[PDB]
């Protein structure tokens, strides 16, 4: 506090496509202003 | 009526198998099927199919002959045909008049009912001379043999199944149903030399029933992946609505899905351009798209003519919360006179032949969708395909 400004750190594992393929490795570094989502 | 198409596609594939196996000099034109004016004094054909049996059985085969006798009754004065498979027996045999009388004999309610419906007057002798009952092998065998043929023809094997094959049968069927004044018969050599240079996927009711369709979707999908993965690019669609099915009520869903996956974020900083050719009225579509939630850039100032500048500009964007002035771009083709400063990265065409913007650097992608719901699987918007 001082607004609130939460923070959530994270570490990368791998990649998942739509068809379903999982590929291991930090193949891509995500660009900012890109949304985050929760995992089913 | 029932309209058993599989027999028709088998008949056309027989045309095609003979065409591929044919030597130099051969010249034929398609015998027009009834299911298409009836061009020609008497030049027509028709066919149906049945192939399920462990051994020949004269018992089941009747119904086609009865319904075809009825068809003959409704109109005549115009050949006929038939195809079917049973193990072992093959070849063509001319039925006897006594056999035709037996066919007159019926032991079933439906057969006798059709007989009662059938006109009393008949020419069983003209039927024997004009009608026939042939027997052949199953279709998939013919398809796989055609595959080997196309291989022998010496074409790029990776692309045989996607473009060459589905487009061949389509070219062949183009002659089955058409009205124009031009040379009818098709020579083989020019046929092949021409088809070898055409690259435009083709879907339709005909190809849909084609046996090997699965690989086509998957190939064309794995092709466009990199083309639809980047965020910032310039895309240009073009459409003709005269021949598509149920346009007015299904274009909107497509537009919404596209604009709601590819132009809903911040880093998407070059919204697409959709173009329609013909005589469509943009007003109603603009209105409904507003009613949905999206806004458009007609390109106009005062409703007289289009300005090539404003249409291509970049939009304003703000992060928190997100707002975007224009999300899509609309304009008719005939009105757009000029060119873009930056040459597009992908130019998709639906049911069109040629455009001025084509080039070497610009990538083209030519399709022939009959309905619009199929392309949705090609562009990653739905998991299943109808």
Tab-separated table of C-alpha atoms in Angstrom:
chain	number	residue	atom	x	y	z
A	1	UNK	CA	0.000	0.000	0.000
A	2	UNK	CA	1.030	3.653	0.027
A	3	UNK	CA	-3.504	2.156	-4.344
A	4	UNK	CA	-2.748	-1.513	-3.715
A	5	UNK	CA	-0.363	-2.949	-6.347
A	6	UNK	CA	-0.367	-6.691	-5.815
A	7	UNK	CA	2.382	-8.877	-7.266
A	8	UNK	CA	2.741	-12.503	-8.348
A	9	UNK	CA	6.120	-13.884	-9.365
A	10	UNK	CA	6.368	-16.931	-11.590
A	11	UNK	CA	8.816	-19.311	-13.248
A	12	UNK	CA	8.493	-20.932	-16.676
A	13	UNK	CA	8.223	-24.559	-17.691
A	14	UNK	CA	6.869	-25.159	-21.161
A	15	UNK	CA	4.414	-24.455	-23.940
A	16	UNK	CA	0.957	-25.749	-24.832
A	17	UNK	CA	-0.801	-25.224	-28.144
A	18	UNK	CA	-4.458	-25.464	-29.064
A	19	UNK	CA	-4.374	-28.811	-30.878
A	20	UNK	CA	-2.801	-30.134	-27.697
A	21	UNK	CA	0.923	-30.416	-28.239
A	22	UNK	CA	3.174	-29.829	-25.250
A	23	UNK	CA	6.706	-28.657	-25.972
A	24	UNK	CA	9.294	-28.368	-23.232
A	25	UNK	CA	11.665	-25.442	-22.979
A	26	UNK	CA	11.479	-21.667	-22.594
A	27	UNK	CA	11.116	-21.363	-26.341
A	28	UNK	CA	9.338	-17.995	-26.191
A	29	UNK	CA	9.695	-14.953	-23.984
A	30	UNK	CA	6.252	-13.385	-23.610
A	31	UNK	CA	5.724	-9.749	-24.483
A	32	UNK	CA	4.200	-7.356	-21.944
A	33	UNK	CA	0.600	-6.214	-21.842
A	34	UNK	CA	-0.258	-9.861	-22.474
A	35	UNK	CA	-2.991	-11.374	-20.370
A	36	UNK	CA	-2.660	-14.100	-17.769
A	37	UNK	CA	-5.098	-16.905	-17.096
A	38	UNK	CA	-5.880	-19.571	-14.527
A	39	UNK	CA	-5.441	-23.290	-15.120
A	40	UNK	CA	-8.127	-25.957	-15.203
B	1	UNK	CA	-36.225	-37.448	-54.555
B	2	UNK	CA	-33.763	-39.773	-52.831
B	3	UNK	CA	-30.817	-38.487	-54.906
B	4	UNK	CA	-28.211	-41.139	-54.090
B	5	UNK	CA	-25.112	-39.086	-54.851
B	6	UNK	CA	-22.488	-41.754	-54.195
B	7	UNK	CA	-23.456	-43.486	-57.415
B	8	UNK	CA	-23.000	-40.232	-59.263
B	9	UNK	CA	-19.555	-39.602	-57.855
B	10	UNK	CA	-18.618	-43.170	-58.761
B	11	UNK	CA	-19.841	-42.573	-62.309
B	12	UNK	CA	-17.813	-39.394	-62.593
B	13	UNK	CA	-14.799	-41.152	-61.132
B	14	UNK	CA	-15.210	-43.752	-63.850
B	15	UNK	CA	-15.094	-40.987	-66.428
B	16	UNK	CA	-11.952	-39.808	-64.686
B	17	UNK	CA	-10.275	-43.203	-64.474
B	18	UNK	CA	-10.777	-43.738	-68.175
B	19	UNK	CA	-9.528	-40.202	-68.783
B	20	UNK	CA	-6.330	-40.814	-66.863
B	21	UNK	CA	-5.768	-44.209	-68.442
B	22	UNK	CA	-6.624	-42.745	-71.842
B	23	UNK	CA	-4.002	-42.346	-74.537
B	24	UNK	CA	-3.353	-39.493	-76.925
B	25	UNK	CA	-6.115	-38.367	-79.264
B	26	UNK	CA	-9.052	-39.222	-77.003
B	27	UNK	CA	-11.860	-36.654	-77.007
B	28	UNK	CA	-14.976	-36.920	-74.846
B	29	UNK	CA	-17.496	-34.662	-73.160
B	30	UNK	CA	-19.572	-35.421	-70.089
B	31	UNK	CA	-22.920	-37.128	-70.524
B	32	UNK	CA	-25.211	-34.730	-68.685
B	33	UNK	CA	-26.900	-36.209	-65.625
B	34	UNK	CA	-30.570	-35.511	-64.990
B	35	UNK	CA	-29.910	-34.059	-61.543
B	36	UNK	CA	-28.257	-30.947	-63.030
B	37	UNK	CA	-32.905	-27.056	-70.137
B	38	UNK	CA	-31.777	-30.606	-70.958
B	39	UNK	CA	-29.194	-29.589	-73.540
B	40	UNK	CA	-29.138	-31.874	-76.553
B	41	UNK	CA	-32.010	-33.542	-78.381
B	42	UNK	CA	-31.607	-36.777	-76.384
B	43	UNK	CA	-28.341	-36.965	-74.423
B	44	UNK	CA	-28.891	-37.756	-70.746
B	45	UNK	CA	-27.699	-40.235	-68.134
B	46	UNK	CA	-28.441	-41.352	-64.589
B	47	UNK	CA	-27.087	-43.816	-62.060
B	48	UNK	CA	-27.428	-45.232	-58.563
B	49	UNK	CA	-25.474	-47.688	-56.453
B	50	UNK	CA	-25.606	-50.561	-53.984
B	51	UNK	CA	-22.707	-52.788	-52.998
B	52	UNK	CA	-23.528	-54.695	-49.786
B	53	UNK	CA	-23.589	-58.465	-50.202
B	54	UNK	CA	-21.783	-61.674	-49.310
B	55	UNK	CA	-22.997	-63.288	-52.548
B	56	UNK	CA	-25.222	-62.353	-55.463
B	57	UNK	CA	-28.902	-62.000	-54.607
B	58	UNK	CA	-31.495	-61.168	-57.234
B	59	UNK	CA	-33.920	-60.463	-54.391
B	60	UNK	CA	-32.906	-57.034	-53.151
B	61	UNK	CA	-31.906	-55.264	-56.375
B	62	UNK	CA	-35.439	-54.397	-57.464
B	63	UNK	CA	-36.215	-50.945	-56.049
B	64	UNK	CA	-33.856	-48.942	-58.317
B	65	UNK	CA	-35.481	-50.410	-61.400
B	66	UNK	CA	-38.967	-49.529	-60.172
B	67	UNK	CA	-38.150	-45.947	-59.285
B	68	UNK	CA	-36.290	-45.553	-62.587
B	69	UNK	CA	-39.275	-46.926	-64.488
B	70	UNK	CA	-41.319	-44.257	-62.744
B	71	UNK	CA	-38.787	-41.614	-63.765
B	72	UNK	CA	-38.982	-42.898	-67.338
B	73	UNK	CA	-42.753	-42.599	-67.089
B	74	UNK	CA	-42.689	-38.953	-66.041
B	75	UNK	CA	-40.523	-37.998	-69.032
B	76	UNK	CA	-39.133	-39.630	-72.164
B	77	UNK	CA	-38.486	-38.587	-75.748
B	78	UNK	CA	-32.021	-40.158	-72.826
B	79	UNK	CA	-30.006	-43.207	-71.789
B	80	UNK	CA	-29.851	-44.811	-68.347
B	81	UNK	CA	-27.382	-46.885	-66.349
B	82	UNK	CA	-26.697	-48.540	-63.010
B	83	UNK	CA	-23.783	-49.703	-60.874
B	84	UNK	CA	-23.597	-52.171	-58.008
B	85	UNK	CA	-21.219	-54.657	-56.400
B	86	UNK	CA	-21.516	-58.250	-55.242
B	87	UNK	CA	-18.602	-60.608	-54.582
B	88	UNK	CA	-17.353	-62.545	-57.578
B	89	UNK	CA	-19.907	-61.678	-60.231
B	90	UNK	CA	-18.908	-58.840	-62.552
B	91	UNK	CA	-19.359	-57.608	-66.099
B	92	UNK	CA	-22.376	-56.300	-67.969
B	93	UNK	CA	-25.336	-58.462	-68.996
B	94	UNK	CA	-28.416	-57.548	-71.023
B	95	UNK	CA	-31.581	-58.564	-69.187
B	96	UNK	CA	-34.136	-60.646	-71.075
B	97	UNK	CA	-37.769	-59.763	-71.689
B	98	UNK	CA	-38.771	-62.641	-69.402
B	99	UNK	CA	-36.509	-61.175	-66.728
B	100	UNK	CA	-38.232	-57.825	-67.216
B	101	UNK	CA	-41.621	-59.468	-66.754
B	102	UNK	CA	-40.321	-61.052	-63.557
B	103	UNK	CA	-39.334	-57.546	-62.511
B	104	UNK	CA	-42.958	-56.655	-63.188
B	105	UNK	CA	-43.668	-59.272	-60.543
B	106	UNK	CA	-43.680	-57.825	-57.046
B	107	UNK	CA	-44.100	-59.415	-53.619
B	108	UNK	CA	-43.708	-56.284	-51.477
B	109	UNK	CA	-46.077	-53.532	-50.414
B	110	UNK	CA	-43.705	-50.738	-51.446
B	111	UNK	CA	-42.831	-52.291	-54.805
B	112	UNK	CA	-46.463	-53.024	-55.653
B	113	UNK	CA	-47.361	-49.518	-54.486
B	114	UNK	CA	-44.826	-47.955	-56.845
B	115	UNK	CA	-46.140	-50.246	-59.585
B	116	UNK	CA	-49.668	-48.961	-58.987
B	117	UNK	CA	-48.205	-45.454	-59.099
B	118	UNK	CA	-46.241	-46.281	-62.246
B	119	UNK	CA	-48.100	-45.444	-65.441
B	120	UNK	CA	-49.787	-48.485	-66.956
B	121	UNK	CA	-48.252	-47.799	-70.367
B	122	UNK	CA	-44.736	-49.173	-70.795
B	123	UNK	CA	-42.263	-50.303	-73.452
B	124	UNK	CA	-40.464	-53.149	-71.740
B	125	UNK	CA	-38.601	-53.748	-74.993
B	126	UNK	CA	-37.480	-50.118	-75.095
B	127	UNK	CA	-36.515	-50.610	-71.446
B	128	UNK	CA	-34.358	-53.647	-72.207
B	129	UNK	CA	-32.762	-51.778	-75.106
B	130	UNK	CA	-32.373	-48.592	-73.050
B	131	UNK	CA	-31.925	-49.800	-69.448
B	132	UNK	CA	-29.191	-52.034	-68.051
B	133	UNK	CA	-27.886	-53.500	-64.783
B	134	UNK	CA	-24.094	-53.593	-64.461
B	135	UNK	CA	-21.986	-54.865	-61.570
B	136	UNK	CA	-18.610	-53.568	-60.463
B	137	UNK	CA	-16.138	-53.314	-57.598
B	138	UNK	CA	-16.420	-51.077	-54.568
B	139	UNK	CA	-15.442	-47.427	-54.857
B	140	UNK	CA	-12.558	-47.048	-52.408
B	141	UNK	CA	-10.676	-49.488	-54.616
B	142	UNK	CA	-11.227	-47.178	-57.571
B	143	UNK	CA	-10.077	-44.199	-55.524
B	144	UNK	CA	-6.869	-45.901	-54.431
B	145	UNK	CA	-6.211	-46.995	-57.994
B	146	UNK	CA	-6.695	-43.404	-59.121
B	147	UNK	CA	-4.146	-42.418	-56.507
B	148	UNK	CA	-1.578	-44.743	-58.053
B	149	UNK	CA	-2.449	-43.374	-61.477
B	150	UNK	CA	-1.876	-39.783	-60.388
B	151	UNK	CA	1.408	-40.959	-58.902
B	152	UNK	CA	2.429	-42.454	-62.237
B	153	UNK	CA	1.557	-39.100	-63.795
B	154	UNK	CA	4.595	-37.684	-62.022
B	155	UNK	CA	3.286	-34.952	-59.744
B	156	UNK	CA	4.587	-33.643	-56.449
B	157	UNK	CA	3.386	-36.431	-54.121
B	158	UNK	CA	3.006	-34.245	-51.036
B	159	UNK	CA	0.445	-32.040	-52.800
B	160	UNK	CA	-1.458	-34.674	-54.801
B	161	UNK	CA	-4.170	-35.182	-52.212
B	162	UNK	CA	-4.851	-31.548	-51.352
B	163	UNK	CA	-5.078	-29.729	-54.687
B	164	UNK	CA	-4.767	-32.019	-57.715
B	165	UNK	CA	-7.254	-34.714	-56.765
B	166	UNK	CA	-10.093	-32.652	-55.242
B	167	UNK	CA	-9.863	-30.148	-58.083
B	168	UNK	CA	-9.827	-32.810	-60.806
B	169	UNK	CA	-13.234	-34.292	-60.016
B	170	UNK	CA	-14.519	-30.735	-59.687
B	171	UNK	CA	-13.326	-29.801	-63.160
B	172	UNK	CA	-14.939	-32.983	-64.443
B	173	UNK	CA	-18.242	-32.123	-62.805
B	174	UNK	CA	-18.167	-28.551	-64.086
B	175	UNK	CA	-19.171	-30.024	-67.440
B	176	UNK	CA	-21.997	-32.105	-65.982
B	177	UNK	CA	-23.954	-28.935	-65.118
B	178	UNK	CA	-23.456	-25.777	-67.169
B	179	UNK	CA	-25.054	-23.546	-69.804
B	180	UNK	CA	-22.738	-21.806	-72.280
B	181	UNK	CA	-21.595	-21.906	-75.912
B	182	UNK	CA	-18.091	-23.362	-76.249
B	183	UNK	CA	-16.193	-26.517	-77.158
B	184	UNK	CA	-17.602	-29.408	-75.144
B	185	UNK	CA	-15.178	-32.340	-75.313
B	186	UNK	CA	-12.004	-32.306	-73.203
B	187	UNK	CA	-8.633	-33.414	-74.509
B	188	UNK	CA	-6.384	-35.092	-71.942
B	189	UNK	CA	-3.035	-33.497	-72.636
B	190	UNK	CA	-4.096	-29.873	-72.304
B	191	UNK	CA	-6.252	-30.930	-69.357
B	192	UNK	CA	-3.238	-32.182	-67.406
B	193	UNK	CA	-0.892	-29.420	-68.548
B	194	UNK	CA	-3.441	-26.913	-67.275
B	195	UNK	CA	-4.376	-28.534	-63.977
B	196	UNK	CA	-0.688	-28.910	-63.147
B	197	UNK	CA	-0.465	-25.120	-62.745
B	198	UNK	CA	-3.547	-24.380	-60.602
B	199	UNK	CA	-3.277	-24.071	-56.814
B	200	UNK	CA	-6.644	-23.387	-55.185
B	201	UNK	CA	-8.179	-25.673	-52.585
B	202	UNK	CA	-11.735	-26.623	-53.501
B	203	UNK	CA	-14.490	-27.702	-51.123
B	204	UNK	CA	-18.077	-28.366	-52.157
B	205	UNK	CA	-20.919	-30.830	-51.777
B	206	UNK	CA	-19.192	-33.068	-54.300
B	207	UNK	CA	-15.752	-33.173	-52.721
B	208	UNK	CA	-17.333	-33.384	-49.273
B	209	UNK	CA	-18.541	-36.909	-50.009
B	210	UNK	CA	-15.175	-37.726	-51.563
B	211	UNK	CA	-13.627	-40.585	-49.631
B	212	UNK	CA	-10.299	-38.985	-48.698
B	213	UNK	CA	-11.229	-35.611	-47.237
B	214	UNK	CA	-9.672	-35.849	-43.789
B	215	UNK	CA	-6.094	-35.227	-44.835
B	216	UNK	CA	-7.088	-32.110	-46.769
B	217	UNK	CA	-8.353	-30.134	-43.791
B	218	UNK	CA	-5.361	-31.091	-41.680
B	219	UNK	CA	-2.852	-30.153	-44.357
B	220	UNK	CA	-4.435	-26.803	-45.105
B	221	UNK	CA	-4.612	-26.080	-41.387
B	222	UNK	CA	-1.005	-26.953	-40.645
B	223	UNK	CA	-0.056	-24.739	-43.580
B	224	UNK	CA	-1.633	-21.515	-42.330
B	225	UNK	CA	-0.417	-21.874	-38.741
B	226	UNK	CA	2.545	-19.516	-39.004
B	227	UNK	CA	0.446	-17.159	-41.102
B	228	UNK	CA	-2.068	-16.772	-38.263
B	229	UNK	CA	0.277	-16.898	-35.267
B	230	UNK	CA	1.962	-13.506	-35.388
B	231	UNK	CA	0.212	-10.575	-33.758
B	232	UNK	CA	1.041	-7.594	-35.977
B	233	UNK	CA	0.454	-8.142	-39.696
B	234	UNK	CA	-1.727	-6.872	-42.527
B	235	UNK	CA	-4.477	-9.137	-43.830
B	236	UNK	CA	-6.867	-8.593	-46.728
B	237	UNK	CA	-9.955	-10.699	-47.339
B	238	UNK	CA	-12.015	-10.626	-50.535
B	239	UNK	CA	-15.355	-12.339	-51.112
B	240	UNK	CA	-18.039	-12.909	-53.729
B	241	UNK	CA	-21.478	-13.585	-52.175
B	242	UNK	CA	-23.482	-14.531	-55.278
B	243	UNK	CA	-22.805	-18.268	-55.023
B	244	UNK	CA	-22.427	-18.872	-51.289
B	245	UNK	CA	-25.168	-20.348	-49.127
B	246	UNK	CA	-27.025	-18.330	-46.497
B	247	UNK	CA	-24.636	-15.377	-46.584
B	248	UNK	CA	-26.793	-12.691	-45.019
B	249	UNK	CA	-27.171	-14.558	-41.736
B	250	UNK	CA	-23.773	-16.242	-41.345
B	251	UNK	CA	-21.293	-13.566	-42.424
B	252	UNK	CA	-21.788	-11.730	-39.142
B	253	UNK	CA	-20.827	-14.662	-36.951
B	254	UNK	CA	-17.641	-15.176	-38.939
B	255	UNK	CA	-16.709	-11.510	-38.729
B	256	UNK	CA	-17.349	-11.475	-34.995
B	257	UNK	CA	-15.282	-14.562	-34.271
B	258	UNK	CA	-12.380	-13.250	-36.328
B	259	UNK	CA	-12.450	-9.772	-34.811
B	260	UNK	CA	-12.848	-11.302	-31.353
B	261	UNK	CA	-9.761	-13.469	-31.576
B	262	UNK	CA	-7.346	-11.495	-33.746
B	263	UNK	CA	-8.238	-7.850	-33.009
B	264	UNK	CA	-9.233	-7.674	-29.341
B	265	UNK	CA	-5.884	-6.976	-27.653
B	266	UNK	CA	-3.431	-4.107	-27.458
B	267	UNK	CA	-0.514	-5.416	-29.505
B	268	UNK	CA	-2.869	-6.033	-32.432
B	269	UNK	CA	-2.055	-2.802	-34.230
B	270	UNK	CA	-3.128	-3.247	-37.832
B	271	UNK	CA	-6.763	-4.247	-38.111
B	272	UNK	CA	-7.806	-6.178	-41.199
B	273	UNK	CA	-9.735	-5.175	-44.286
B	274	UNK	CA	-12.745	-7.040	-45.619
B	275	UNK	CA	-13.915	-6.448	-49.175
B	276	UNK	CA	-17.076	-7.568	-50.949
B	277	UNK	CA	-17.719	-7.598	-54.698
B	278	UNK	CA	-21.076	-7.376	-56.423
B	279	UNK	CA	-24.102	-5.261	-55.505
B	280	UNK	CA	-24.378	-5.722	-51.737
B	281	UNK	CA	-25.452	-2.869	-49.466
B	282	UNK	CA	-23.039	-2.146	-46.642
B	283	UNK	CA	-25.537	-0.199	-44.551
B	284	UNK	CA	-27.428	-3.088	-42.990
B	285	UNK	CA	-24.245	-4.986	-42.205
B	286	UNK	CA	-22.661	-1.946	-40.597
B	287	UNK	CA	-25.777	-1.474	-38.505
B	288	UNK	CA	-25.882	-5.023	-37.217
B	289	UNK	CA	-22.179	-5.051	-36.436
B	290	UNK	CA	-22.737	-1.929	-34.364
B	291	UNK	CA	-25.664	-3.589	-32.626
B	292	UNK	CA	-23.263	-6.387	-31.736
B	293	UNK	CA	-20.595	-4.190	-30.172
B	294	UNK	CA	-18.036	-3.488	-32.880
B	295	UNK	CA	-17.304	-0.283	-34.786
B	296	UNK	CA	-16.214	0.131	-38.392
B	297	UNK	CA	-14.179	2.460	-40.609
B	298	UNK	CA	-16.132	2.875	-43.837
B	299	UNK	CA	-13.333	5.062	-45.151
B	300	UNK	CA	-15.676	7.813	-46.263
B	301	UNK	CA	-15.926	11.517	-45.540
B	302	UNK	CA	-19.346	12.904	-46.385
B	303	UNK	CA	-20.558	9.866	-48.290
B	304	UNK	CA	-19.306	10.458	-51.823
B	305	UNK	CA	-16.139	8.433	-52.444
B	306	UNK	CA	-13.401	6.528	-50.680
B	307	UNK	CA	-10.051	8.010	-49.697
B	308	UNK	CA	-7.172	5.572	-49.884
B	309	UNK	CA	-5.382	7.390	-47.070
B	310	UNK	CA	-7.753	7.310	-44.115
B	311	UNK	CA	-8.733	3.703	-44.738
B	312	UNK	CA	-5.198	2.478	-44.133
B	313	UNK	CA	-4.290	4.600	-41.125
B	314	UNK	CA	-3.341	3.347	-37.707
B	315	UNK	CA	-5.800	3.536	-34.817
B	316	UNK	CA	-5.624	5.088	-31.396
B	317	UNK	CA	-5.165	2.680	-28.503
B	318	UNK	CA	-5.304	3.034	-24.720
B	319	UNK	CA	-4.410	0.333	-22.232
B	320	UNK	CA	-6.293	0.657	-18.941
B	321	UNK	CA	-9.144	0.148	-19.718
B	322	UNK	CA	-8.914	-1.067	-23.300
B	323	UNK	CA	-10.559	0.930	-26.059
B	324	UNK	CA	-10.004	0.819	-29.788
B	325	UNK	CA	-11.474	3.282	-32.253
B	326	UNK	CA	-11.894	0.949	-35.221
B	327	UNK	CA	-11.606	-2.827	-35.101
B	328	UNK	CA	-12.456	-3.709	-38.697
B	329	UNK	CA	-12.469	-2.079	-42.118
B	330	UNK	CA	-15.067	-2.407	-44.875
B	331	UNK	CA	-15.243	-1.271	-48.482
B	332	UNK	CA	-16.499	-2.522	-51.817
B	333	UNK	CA	-13.861	-3.347	-54.396
B	334	UNK	CA	-15.129	-1.483	-57.451
B	335	UNK	CA	-15.041	1.750	-55.457
B	336	UNK	CA	-11.469	1.312	-54.206
B	337	UNK	CA	-9.200	2.721	-56.916
B	338	UNK	CA	-5.535	2.809	-56.051
B	339	UNK	CA	-3.066	0.798	-54.053
B	340	UNK	CA	-1.448	0.489	-50.636
B	341	UNK	CA	1.902	1.977	-49.750
B	342	UNK	CA	2.867	-1.194	-47.895
B	343	UNK	CA	2.258	-4.374	-49.782
B	344	UNK	CA	0.181	-6.817	-47.732
B	345	UNK	CA	1.566	-9.885	-46.037
B	346	UNK	CA	-1.381	-12.196	-46.716
B	347	UNK	CA	-4.160	-11.866	-49.297
B	348	UNK	CA	-6.976	-14.376	-49.061
B	349	UNK	CA	-9.496	-14.905	-51.840
B	350	UNK	CA	-12.856	-16.664	-51.649
B	351	UNK	CA	-14.592	-17.633	-54.888
B	352	UNK	CA	-12.617	-15.306	-57.149
B	353	UNK	CA	-10.149	-15.784	-59.987
B	354	UNK	CA	-7.790	-12.814	-60.271
B	355	UNK	CA	-7.099	-9.441	-58.689
B	356	UNK	CA	-4.793	-6.571	-59.538
B	357	UNK	CA	-2.967	-6.598	-56.203
B	358	UNK	CA	-1.287	-9.959	-56.789
B	359	UNK	CA	2.495	-9.921	-56.822
B	360	UNK	CA	5.544	-12.040	-56.109
B	361	UNK	CA	6.268	-11.022	-52.523
B	362	UNK	CA	2.596	-11.047	-51.555
B	363	UNK	CA	1.347	-14.494	-50.614
B	364	UNK	CA	-1.904	-15.642	-52.185
B	365	UNK	CA	-4.312	-18.275	-50.908
B	366	UNK	CA	-7.184	-19.297	-53.147
B	367	UNK	CA	-10.204	-21.185	-51.863
B	368	UNK	CA	-13.592	-22.201	-53.246
B	369	UNK	CA	-15.732	-22.667	-50.150
B	370	UNK	CA	-19.394	-23.369	-50.803
B	371	UNK	CA	-20.468	-22.609	-47.245
B	372	UNK	CA	-18.736	-20.317	-44.776
B	373	UNK	CA	-18.731	-22.617	-41.763
B	374	UNK	CA	-15.950	-24.764	-43.211
B	375	UNK	CA	-13.331	-22.021	-43.380
B	376	UNK	CA	-13.856	-21.573	-39.647
B	377	UNK	CA	-12.011	-24.836	-39.065
B	378	UNK	CA	-9.296	-23.775	-41.463
B	379	UNK	CA	-8.621	-20.615	-39.464
B	380	UNK	CA	-8.766	-22.115	-35.950
B	381	UNK	CA	-12.167	-21.005	-34.693
B	382	UNK	CA	-13.934	-24.325	-34.072
B	383	UNK	CA	-12.652	-27.788	-33.236
B	384	UNK	CA	-15.076	-29.873	-35.297
B	385	UNK	CA	-16.187	-29.544	-38.926
B	386	UNK	CA	-19.962	-29.903	-39.148
